[PDB]
Amino acid sequence: SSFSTQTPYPNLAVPFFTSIPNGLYPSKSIVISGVVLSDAKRFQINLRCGGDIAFHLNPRFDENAVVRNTQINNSWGPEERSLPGSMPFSRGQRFSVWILCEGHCFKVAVDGQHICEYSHRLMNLPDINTLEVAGDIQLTHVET
Ligand SMILES: OC[C@H]1O[C@@H](O[C@H]2[C@H](O)[C@@H](O)[C@@H](O)O[C@@H]2CO)[C@H](O)[C@@H](O)[C@H]1O
Ligand code: NA
Hints:
mainly beta, Jelly Rolls, 6-stranded antiparallel sheet, 5-stranded antiparallel sheet, 51% strand, binds a molecule of 2 linked components (GLC-GAL), binds sodium ion, lactose binding, lectin, Galectin_CRD, Galectin-like
């Protein structure tokens, strides 16, 4: 019961880009809320610094997976895929993703359940200053 043809909220169409004020720093929180499309294949949340993706968070409904990675100078590193339980996103279902930036890693929770910790690979946190949300979701709220 959610499809890409539904009218987005003002300024919340996808792909969505917004600034992270002051860039990342230890204790900085980001919250992204929305609904996965009923026919979703994948979507991604990217914390970007210049031409690189410091943190790529990629729920995949075709693979029943949540892929995490970093892209540096247009190349991908090794993927992290471990999950504590089942696939925390579902087609047609609302989600709230909380990303916590600590000094050494990201902590990521979905609907209040921790799903992964991701060690910082790009450590210049204040340059990680752009958030992108793209793919098969409708967005309802973003706080950075
Ligand atoms: O790792 C993030 C990127 O993965 C790309 O696909 C990978 C794939 O997951 C992996 O199994 C292997 O085959 O290499 C592919 C190319 O890196 C996605 O295409 C890309 O969008 C990112 O999600
Ligand atoms: Na799509």
